[PDB]
Swiss-Prot record, chain A:
Entry-linked Gene3D superfamilies: 3.100.10.10, 4.10.990.10
PTM sites of type (3S)-3-hydroxyhistidine: H38
Superkingdom of the source species: Eukaryota
Protein species of origin: Oryctolagus cuniculus
Modified residues (Phosphoserine): S67
Name recorded for this polypeptide: Large ribosomal subunit protein uL15
Subunit composition and interactions: Component of the large ribosomal subunit.
Annotated family: Belongs to the universal ribosomal protein uL15 family.
Keywords of this entry: Acetylation, Cytoplasm, Hydroxylation, Phosphoprotein, Ribonucleoprotein, Ribosomal protein
InterPro entries in the record: Rbsml_uL15_N (IPR027386), Ribosomal_uL15 (IPR030878), Ribosomal_uL15/eL18 (IPR021131), Ribosomal_uL15/eL18_sf (IPR036227), Ribosomal_uL15_CS (IPR001196)
PTM text: Hydroxylated on His-38 by MINA.
GO-annotated molecular function: structural constituent of ribosome
Curated annotation (Swiss-Prot), chain D:
Description of post-translational modifications: Citrullinated by PADI4.
Family according to the record: Belongs to the universal ribosomal protein uL4 family.
Segment of the intact protein contained: 36 to 84 of 413
UniProt lineage: Eukaryota, Metazoa, Chordata, Craniata, Vertebrata
Gene assigned in the entry: RPL4
Superkingdom assignment: Eukaryota
Organism of derivation: Oryctolagus cuniculus (Rabbit)
Function text: Component of the large ribosomal subunit. The ribosome is a large ribonucleoprotein complex responsible for the synthesis of proteins in the cell.
Compartments reported by the entry: Cytoplasm
Record note on quaternary structure: Component of the large ribosomal subunit. May bind IPO9 with low affinity. Interacts with RBM3.
Protein name: Large ribosomal subunit protein uL4
Length: 147, 49, 201, 49
RNA sequence: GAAAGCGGGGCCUCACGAUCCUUCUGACCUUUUGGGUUUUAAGCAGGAGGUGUCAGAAAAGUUACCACAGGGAUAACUGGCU
RNA sequence: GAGUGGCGCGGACGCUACGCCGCGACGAGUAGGAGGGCCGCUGCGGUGAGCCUUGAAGCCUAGGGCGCGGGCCCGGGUGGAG
RNA sequence: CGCGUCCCCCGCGAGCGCACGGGGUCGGCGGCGAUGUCGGCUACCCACCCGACCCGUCUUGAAACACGGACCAAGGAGUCUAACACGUGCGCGAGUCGGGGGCUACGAAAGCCGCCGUGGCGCAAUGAAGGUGAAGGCCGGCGCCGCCGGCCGAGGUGGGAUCCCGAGGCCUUCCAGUCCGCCGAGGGCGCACCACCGGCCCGUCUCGCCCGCCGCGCCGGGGAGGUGGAGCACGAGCGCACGUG
RNA sequence: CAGUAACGGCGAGUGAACAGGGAAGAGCCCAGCGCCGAAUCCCCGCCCCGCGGCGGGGCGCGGGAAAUGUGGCGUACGGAAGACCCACUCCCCGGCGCCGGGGGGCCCAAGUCCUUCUGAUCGAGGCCCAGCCCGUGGACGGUGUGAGGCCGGUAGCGGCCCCCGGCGCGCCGGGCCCGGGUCUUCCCGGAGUCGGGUUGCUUGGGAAUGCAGCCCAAAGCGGGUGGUAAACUCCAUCUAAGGCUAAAUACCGGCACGAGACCGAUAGUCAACAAGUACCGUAAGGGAAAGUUGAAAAGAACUUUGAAGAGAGAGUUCAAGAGGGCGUGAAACCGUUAAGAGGUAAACGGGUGGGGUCCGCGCAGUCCGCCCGGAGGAUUCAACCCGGCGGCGGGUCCGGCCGUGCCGGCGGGGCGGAUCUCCCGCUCCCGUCGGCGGGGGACCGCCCCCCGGCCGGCGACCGGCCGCCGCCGGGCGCAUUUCCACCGCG
């Protein structure tokens, strides 16, 4: 939309909204991220701290799949199953705990951010946190591991 | 889903539920009054003092 | 020159990029020509499946993906061997063949052997001279009821097991899964010099 | 919504238009220099036309 | 120092220096990429090697053969104030 | 405010609510910023049962007017298809 | 300027009219009228009084003995693409999005897929790293246990738009009085948000004491007190479109 | 994936790959090792069919190539020979007869109907109570404006004649006479090349990713790779230094088409025209300007002045106020006609006055209610019958339909659910508990529908009989009523 723009209301106005004392000249402070350590030092030090210099070890050939570990919390754990399972698990009197395979849902590790509703459950995860495990012992459950 | 179900505010604003819980209209217009100098104008001075 | 707080950008446009802009006005004519060539082929190989041959079941490598299943390239020779199909007959009756595939496991094998037994049962085979049949061919009942197949032949879907709600054992609740992880990590790390010091001992 | 969705959907059935990439620059012109009382633009390189 | 206390440099106001690279020091430290042992290398933390144009380019002249962009923001004339 | 006891067939305008109305104070302005344009140009989707050889665009004008202005609308002439 | 009644001393008359009264009216008049006069501001020409230096631009300062401009017509200068940030409109919402692919004149459009969400961005951070990875008191048994258990359980303070209760009260010649509607003394629940104090997660330091076992070891886990983080503390994101930088 | 791992005066900047989802999908052959009497190939001369891709057959003590290795078998997925089981008759290239992709040419609906405007119609109005006619055709172009119907075309899984392809039955020519499963017995491979040292370039590739020069130069339970230099050691993964190979991809050149929210002759290609032209440069090279009379030339016979260019009359045309570089005809600037003015260069803002130009189509001057005052006219009100239509409420009638409503039924199904469990598959122990995967059947959820009852509605969604009011039409009424037009200086 060229009608709604600012240009259309600078027609008549001399400088086209770029000043009279200092003009609209081409590149009056260099191009791109230039002058970083010299005449744009304050902008870089103030809004982009730690930009210049080296930190840590170089890992030449890095494959992102070996370090693949998507997390779920106990908050959203009962949502990988139906509401049917949770309801019928309390409705059953035998003490049978429904089995939540976490890797079927597409999470490897279980973290322990969440409050858990009070019924027994088994969790077939690839990894477990300490507080994550303790909370499922606290509710009265199991932590089966997956290879 | 609709953002308001019943879009007939003709019916709504005169319906007894709403009209019950209103305050009376202030429908009388008060234009400016010309200031008459009551030191010259006797009756206006009597209207004040 | 930077104004205020804002992201520090590095646009890759320092070369003669305007000469090598590739614009996609081809796209709806490219889709039409592909759909044309597709239907042309599907009519050419007339009663044979439109997708072409049957691809085998294959696990994705790399831990990120190995919980999935794809279509593989072609059936290993030691899957054809134990299924009882010749590697030079297989390709002529519509079975993809890969001469590079190894078989580390026997379940990866046995799934693909039962894949070929189902395929060789489903397959209708026409006479090479249509008036005089041969032994390994189909019955004229099935030959008149034979039809062009749409989409990938015996398609590969990804099904998981059903685990019924069980009562949690007194040991199963007792097992320390976090401590097991942590002490499996240290047994993997320190093992090498635990063998060294025990050798020097 | 229909005004927005009609405005944006109608731009999809639209053949592109441009000028020639080479148009304008197909000469060998150069600036004359600041002397010789002309206006310092490029001028078509000399001849008898 | 008997003790109250006083002392983490000079009675006080000055005496000094970033990224990169190097060099040393520290832990029974992490990593060296398919697994182990060992040299090596890379890391993490703290000092030093120095930028005196001292918030820190690596740097000699000449042009009367000279050239371009500008400047009355700036000299060689008049004119003005003194 | 509300309950139980002690003849004549009449009544202006209004309220495009994105509208209409009432009262009070205020109004310099370069660079610059924002808003409102029933200011103007050229093309596309809708729409005006639009205009037009009984004369479209364009152009000229001591003609008649509107708008704070951008501009615009009628009269007369020329012109010949939008 | 009525008495029928409330003290210390000596509740509705009726009219008519004039107006220094919430902004001007006349129920007053008089001329002149068809090719010679009436109106017509603006607009053509002229005269007179007052005012009045030539625009643009850089400049502390331009009418300048500063530069550009003889005159006229047509052309003629913040655009498009990618990136980012913030505001704004729309759709869905712990999600969101087919953009690449496939299916069945206008139309190279529109429609559809979900076992086409691969994937992108989001829902978890911190460490160079290996790695680790987001709330608890009490009540018994084992003035104490590493725990066996049992009940309940996402903080506190101050300010906070609204909401809630209601000491009393809102009339017609009274007295009780019943129902709705309404005002309000004072007293409570407290949204978002702000300030403060707690707490939890990761890194790292100081001090110390207990627990575990298919693998008793330079094995693994735990506690208290500061401290570094682009964190948690019952989600706000994604896609599209527009605006300014 | 990803502006990521990485490179970078670690500054400015630069910057891939694997995995994953698709588009497409296709695989093979030598040398070597070996066995088959060189079993192989090229060419001349004669004959026959018969080949605008020079090919098949017969014939020759015709000639050559080749053991310094041609062909058959055969290649890392193993191969070959010998023994025992097992079972086949059909692959391939070239003539034909017939039906069932493209290039060419010729064609196929309906108004020039009746009045009317114009120079000319394609405009305007009309065309049965059979909405002019056709419409699988209402794209576009031409035609004296603007045309579905005048013409070419357009539509059509429309017609006809030619020509060149593609495939299958089978007649018919030629060749080839060929399989697999298991043991025993042999065999197995590319060297100035890998590799290392150094040098230069290159890379995202960092103690060196790729390529190259020179020097050194291998091995065979080897060699290569395993993103940090090196030694020892397990493990994984390929088989380098020989070769061929479709499809999916790219395309401002070329031949042909179709289109556009693009430009509309100072624009758009430099080029709408005798444009890469004229012209310029010794040359390499540089490189313009330039569209439009009119529907139709009907392009001005003839008279007349002049040496002629040029005029003046006639004449054609709707028009020369369109006259051959001629549609429209702006401004600058110039000529002339009219008006006014004029010694402070002109021009300018404010305020008037004077004169023009046209305009009000000026010049006896506003209409509007009701009433009163006179006078005319009309078949005329109020009421009451008969009909049709509408409104509301019928507070709460009778019957219907709906529900981002709800409660029932032993009412009859669709999807769904990470809710549960009877038949069949393969195999394991020997018809055979139990294992295995895929179908069925119970249960929960939402939904669709049939019967039942409330609650809401019918104002985003209704009828019929009542009742009242209102309207319209026709009777009836017929004048102190009602209603029209005209005067009164009301």
């Amino acid at each position: 939309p060229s009608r709604l723009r600012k240009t259309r209301k600078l027609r008549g106005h001399v400088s086209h909204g770029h000043g009279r004392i200092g003009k609209h000249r081409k590149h009056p402070g260099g191009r791109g991220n230039a002058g970083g350590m010299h005449h744009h030092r304050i902008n870089f030090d103030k809004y982009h701290p730690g930009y210049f210099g080296k930190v840590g070890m170089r890992h030449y050939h890095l494959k992102r799949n070996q370090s693949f570990c998507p997390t779920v919390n106990l908050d959203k754990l009962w949502t990988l199953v139906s509401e049917q399972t949770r309801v019928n698990a309390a409705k059953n009197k035998t003490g049978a705990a429904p089995i939540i395979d976490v890797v079927r849902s597409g999470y490897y590790k279980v973290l322990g951010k969440g409050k858990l509703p009070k019924q027994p459950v088994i969790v077939k995860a690839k990894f477990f946190s300490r507080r994550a495990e303790e909370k499922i012992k606290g509710v009265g459950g199991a932590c089966v591991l997956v290879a | 889903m609709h953002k308001m179900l019943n879009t007939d505010l003709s019916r709504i604003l005169k319906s007894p539920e709403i009209q019950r819980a209103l305050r009376a209209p202030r429908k009388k217009i008060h234009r400016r009054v010309l200031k008459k100098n009551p030191l010259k104008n006797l009756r206006i001075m009597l209207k004040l003092n | 020159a930077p104004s205020r707080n804002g992201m520090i950008l590095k646009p890759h446009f320092h070369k003669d990029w305007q000469r090598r802009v590739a614009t996609w006005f081809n796209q709806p004519a490219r889709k039409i020509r592909r759909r044309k060539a597709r239907q042309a082929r599907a009519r050419r190989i007339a009663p044979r499946p439109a997708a072409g041959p049957i691809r085998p079941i294959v696990r994705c490598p790399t831990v990120r993906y190995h919980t999935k299943v794809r279509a593989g390239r072609g059936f290993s020779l030691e899957e054809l061997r134990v299924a009882g199909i010749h590697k030079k007959v297989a390709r002529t009756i519509g079975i993809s063949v890969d001469p590079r595939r190894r078989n580390k496991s026997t379940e990866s094998l046995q799934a693909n052997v039962q894949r070929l037994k189902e395929y060789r049962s489903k397959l209708v085979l026409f006479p090479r001279k249509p008036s005089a049949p041969k032994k390994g061919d189909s019955s004229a009942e099935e030959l008149k009821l034979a039809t062009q197949l749409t989409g990938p032949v015996m398609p590969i879907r990804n099904v998981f097991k059903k685990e019924k709600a069980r009562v949690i054992t007194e040991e199963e609740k007792n097992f320390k899964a976090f401590a097991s992880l942590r002490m499996a990590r240290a047994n993997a790390r320190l093992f090498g010099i635990r063998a060294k010091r025990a050798k020097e001992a | 919504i229909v005004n927005f969705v009609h405005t944006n959907l109608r731009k999809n059935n639209r053949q592109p238009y441009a000028v020639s990439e080479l148009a304008g620059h197909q000469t060998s012109a150069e600036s004359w220099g600041t002397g010789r009382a002309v206006a310092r633009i490029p001028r078509v390189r000399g001849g008898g036309t």
